[PDB]
Amino acid sequence: AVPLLNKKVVKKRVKRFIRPQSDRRITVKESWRRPKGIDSRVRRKFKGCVLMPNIGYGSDKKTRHYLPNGFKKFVVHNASELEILMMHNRTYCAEIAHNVSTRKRKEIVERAAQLDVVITNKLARLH
Amino acid sequence: KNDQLKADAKARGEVISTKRQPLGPKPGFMVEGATLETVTPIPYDVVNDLKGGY
Amino acid sequence: GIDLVAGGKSKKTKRTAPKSDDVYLKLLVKLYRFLARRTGSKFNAVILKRLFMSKINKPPLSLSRLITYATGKGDNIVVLVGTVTDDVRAYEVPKIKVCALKFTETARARIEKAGGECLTFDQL
Amino acid sequence: AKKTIRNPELIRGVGKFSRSKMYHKKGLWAIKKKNGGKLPLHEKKPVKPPKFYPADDVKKPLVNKHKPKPTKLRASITPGTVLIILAGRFKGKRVVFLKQLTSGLLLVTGPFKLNGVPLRRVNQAYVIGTSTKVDVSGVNVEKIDDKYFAKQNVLPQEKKDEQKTVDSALLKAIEGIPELKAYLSARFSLKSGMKPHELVF
Amino acid sequence: VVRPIKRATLKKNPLKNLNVLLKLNPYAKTARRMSLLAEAQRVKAKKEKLDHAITKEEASAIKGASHSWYKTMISDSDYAEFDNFTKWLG
Amino acid sequence: QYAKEYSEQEKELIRLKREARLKGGFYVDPEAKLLFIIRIRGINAMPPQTKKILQLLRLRQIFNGVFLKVNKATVNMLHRVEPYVTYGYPNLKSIKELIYKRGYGKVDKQRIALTDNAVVEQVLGKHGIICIEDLVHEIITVGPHFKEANNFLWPFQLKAPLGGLKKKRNHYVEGGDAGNRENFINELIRRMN
RNA sequence: AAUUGUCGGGAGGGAAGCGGAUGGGGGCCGGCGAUGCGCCCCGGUCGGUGUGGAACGGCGAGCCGGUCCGCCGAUCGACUCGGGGCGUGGACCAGCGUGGAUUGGGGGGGCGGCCAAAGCCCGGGCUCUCGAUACGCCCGUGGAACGCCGUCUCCCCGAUUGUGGAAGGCAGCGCGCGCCUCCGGCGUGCUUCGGCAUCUGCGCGCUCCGGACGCUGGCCUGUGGGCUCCCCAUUCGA
RNA sequence: GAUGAGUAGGAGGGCGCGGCGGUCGCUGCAAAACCUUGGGCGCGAGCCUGGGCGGAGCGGCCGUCGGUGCAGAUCUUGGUG
Ligand SMILES: [K+]
Ligand SMILES: [K+]
Ligand SMILES: [K+]
Ligand SMILES: [K+]
Ligand SMILES: [K+]
Ligand SMILES: [K+]
Ligand SMILES: [K+]
Ligand SMILES: [K+]
Ligand SMILES: [Mg+2]
Ligand SMILES: [Mg+2]
Ligand SMILES: [Mg+2]
Ligand SMILES: [Mg+2]
Ligand SMILES: [Mg+2]
Ligand SMILES: [Mg+2]
Ligand SMILES: [Mg+2]
Ligand SMILES: [Mg+2]
Ligand SMILES: [Mg+2]
Ligand SMILES: [Mg+2]
Ligand SMILES: [Mg+2]
Ligand SMILES: [Mg+2]
Ligand SMILES: [Mg+2]
Ligand SMILES: [Mg+2]
Ligand SMILES: [Mg+2]
Ligand SMILES: [Mg+2]
Ligand SMILES: [Mg+2]
Ligand SMILES: [Mg+2]
Ligand SMILES: [Mg+2]
Ligand SMILES: [Mg+2]
Ligand SMILES: [Mg+2]
Ligand SMILES: [Mg+2]
Ligand SMILES: [Mg+2]
Ligand SMILES: [Mg+2]
């Protein structure tokens, strides 16, 4: 399958937004939280501090949610759901759900080859 | 005055405006030459720094 | 920086669509979105806006008040973005063509008995 | 028919004569008489089934009206000019410029006998044109072109003979100028205190 | 009763792009041609060393009037009203 | 026709000045009818009066520029925002460059680049202005339809001056950059357009 | 999970951690990167106008259809069928060319203004000296070059960048549609006598013209490429 | 076409947890939970997936509901420097 997308993917930021002071404290997890403190230097945006996520970092709408291979991901749980991508094989690639058995993955992989549907994790748990 | 000016202009088919206008820039003109009086700064005198002098 | 208020953006709010989930109302909105765009008629634009409005902004019209405003205008079609109710205080109901979102059971019977017609906005 | 352009250009896109002047020169007045006092009117100049239908409509790029122009030749570079190669295996060697090919590249020769540089194509951006000129009037390279340097290792004997034929006519001209043979046999290099932006070539 | 069924142009600098300028001001071409031709004549005239628009009497009057005006421009005050500083002012 | 008129006016002024010189008198040049105003201070710490006046002049951003007709009403307004602006008398060259390079028309309250004469005609057509040259002529001569023609022009978004400013905090007379610089506004327009 | 031992990698001149930017060393990733397509004949395989049946349909009794089976005629076509010949070529990176937009820098030319520059040089008249061999004043439609300011215009170099994917549109021109000796010449109208959108329509083309195209090379299981992952170093920030 | 600061505060659109009414699925050819210097998506809350461990359950989507989201409270209980 030849991906239909042609515009290059431009990531405004590749680094993640780490919660302030999550390094210092184990109990403070890395998932982002907006600091609400009155004196918070991160909230007040002093230079040399952690950056906060804002809408300006929004990626181009034409290249949004596109994987590096040039397709968009759709999660499939069986052979029937794989057939939904027959007419979108140049736009959407399938990914077998994490909890599908190895026996049923063989059917999905075989069917995807017939339909020319890209499978992102086709080598999963076959050894 | 505005009513009569518009009435007079209406009969002759000439659209005009009766609005007032603020003072605009003056046009160019020639001024006849005359004797020129030279103005220069005055030398300072401390005695004159008071109404009527010291 | 730019010396504007709220970055030059509007701070006014108006209804751009009905708040209701009524499937029939949304079909009427689609119908009159097309009519307003492709005709430029002021009537269609007014009708489209009033279809968005809330219940209190679409008050009912009594049959008696409808008759008085329709006196001497038999040929014209009465249009109401709202409900038409029956009025026991009105005795003589002339034949009239009325379009409304909803007719009460008594109001519909009286209008139909008098030879009039009750229309919807799709028939209008 | 007309032998020369009617309207020479003072600058690119602006003619020397105005519309009123051009009407006289175009002869439209004469044409009008011959056609009953009217300018003649002409008329405008008057499959296999697919084997596969794509699911996504194909998109064709919009029309671009800009057309590439031939590569320009630096004013410093003239036939017979000595060039200094700035890059590649022959960096620093002094060669003789013969002509510019259709592709825009420069055709140069060592000559091969003096410095071992054969008939080769060198990009204009990687050479410096000096002020030394060697006569190449007797050199014939009309047979050489872009296709002569196209791939399809032992060098065929045919090209070796071709090099000598072109080289031979050039050696006599080089030998005429004293010390020119040694000049072409030595590579250019920068020594201490030598500033490229101040050097005269 | 329906009415018949119904991208931004990249702005270019007319001060540099000739065709863009002619699209807005067609007369710009005539002005350009005349300026180029006028300059060419002047350049040619200077090389050939090619050789008045005022009457001889008028020229004399002009020189006198300008010379008289210049005298007033450089004229100085007599500094007579400063009686207390006559010596200092010289 | 406009090109011929501009040259005639320039030569007409020269002739009159020479004529006055010959007779020994003076020729007072006509007072400037057109001004170009540029905002040189930012939008921080604005007193209420200055803030309102700059809005009426459509100078809401530093280095924005607009034309302004000369009359006692407008001049007195401009006198009250002197330290926040610099202005002067634009020549024909300045008006051409501004309209041609940075000219945008206000069509239905939208900023539209003057790429074609159709844009000018869409708004100013009823006033007889159908091309950019007509728009230039109306501005330079301050014609009867100056108000509509000038308002049609979106305030010019000029760049920071190439070469910088001397001192925005002092008046141009003191060696600064604020206030009336008369014909020297053209020198600044070159470096900011 | 806090916390601890051990093995392995790494760092450490009075904290460490953290933001941003690269680099070194690791680890990881083949949808990390293609190998097809078009046209030929050799063979193989599989189906083909007009009339018969089977089960149905679109439009609204009647017209208009396809699918499947069979029979004739017609004799071609198809083939993720196997070989051969010819043409063509994918991902990423880099270079170059020709241009558009934005922008900085450099060089030259024309014209205008001024005391219709001043001055200087030439010619003429006057004045006649202490810094001693002057100081300067006035004249000429004399002459050769500047200066400042304004404006018109030509050329050269570098930097960043290609967003859009429906339109050969808009604008300005060229060549034909009439002849000549062809850097130009030949007809009306207007003219400042230089010129002029006054005649300047059609057809086919060109271009600074409704947003970048083209060419070449490198590399493609490698010590390669990429990386948002890991450790660490360094400059700035903190 | 214009435009982008925000404490207290207001509002919108979304993410996540556990049930219920439905609907579409997964699982001893290995569910949940947990672990990972595997990889990717989203501005972000989060989401998807490789490998490992584990050995019996689980998830998506629509609607609806709630004892539904923690770094602090000399917070509670337990554990540990
Ligand atoms: K350990
Ligand atoms: K100049
Ligand atoms: K470029
Ligand atoms: K490669
Ligand atoms: K650092
Ligand atoms: K369920
Ligand atoms: K994981
Ligand atoms: K739920
Ligand atoms: Mg991200
Ligand atoms: Mg505070
Ligand atoms: Mg798993
Ligand atoms: Mg802003
Ligand atoms: Mg605000
Ligand atoms: Mg301040
Ligand atoms: Mg702006
Ligand atoms: Mg600079
Ligand atoms: Mg400063
Ligand atoms: Mg201050
Ligand atoms: Mg632990
Ligand atoms: Mg001059
Ligand atoms: Mg593009
Ligand atoms: Mg905000
Ligand atoms: Mg759940
Ligand atoms: Mg870990
Ligand atoms: Mg979920
Ligand atoms: Mg509960
Ligand atoms: Mg609770
Ligand atoms: Mg806690
Ligand atoms: Mg808290
Ligand atoms: Mg505690
Ligand atoms: Mg405790
Ligand atoms: Mg303890």
Numbering used by the authors:
A (entry chain g): 2 to 128
B (entry chain V): 111 to 164
C (entry chain S): 2 to 125
D (entry chain H): 3 to 48, 55 to 160, 181 to 229
E (entry chain F): 306 to 311, 317 to 361, 365 to 403
F (entry chain I): 50 to 242
Q: Could you share sentences copied from the article?
A:
Ribosomes are fundamental to all forms of life on earth. Their activity is regulated via chemical modifications of the four rRNA species: 25S, 18S, 5.8S, and 5S. Here, we report the structure of a plant cytosolic ribosome and a quantitative mass spectrometry analysis of its rRNAs. The overall structure of a plant ribosome is generally conserved relative to its eukaryotic counterparts, including in regions that are responsible for the binding of mRNA and tRNAs.
Using the structural approach, we obtained a 2.38-Å resolution cryo-EM reconstruction that allowed us to build an accurate atomic model with a minimal clash score of 2.02. Of the total mass of approximately 3 MDa, 10% represents rRNA expansion segments (ESs) that occur on the surface. We found that, although most of the ESs are intrinsically flexible, an approximately 138-nucleotide ES27L adopts two defined conformations related by approximately 90°. The yeast counterpart has been shown to act as an RNA scaffold that recruits the N-terminal processing enzyme MetAP, which controls the accuracy of ribosome decoding in translation fidelity (Fujii et al., 2018). Because enzymatic activities adapt to light fluctuations in plants (Martinez-Seidel et al., 2021), the defined conformations of ES27L are likely to serve a regulatory role. Using the mass spectrometry approach, we identified 71 post-transcriptional modifications and mapped them onto the structure. Overall, 216 modifications could be assigned, 71 of which are plant specific, meaning that they are not found in other organisms. Among all the assigned modifications, 89 are strongly supported by the cryo-EM density map. Through a combination of analysis of the density map, sequencing, and alignments, we detected 9 deletions, 18 insertions, and 4 mutations in the S. lycopersicum rRNA, which allowed us to correct the sequence for the model organism. The plant and human ribosome have a similar number of species-specific rRNA modifications in each of the ribosomal subunits. However, the two subunits differ markedly in the spatial distribution of their species-specific modifications.
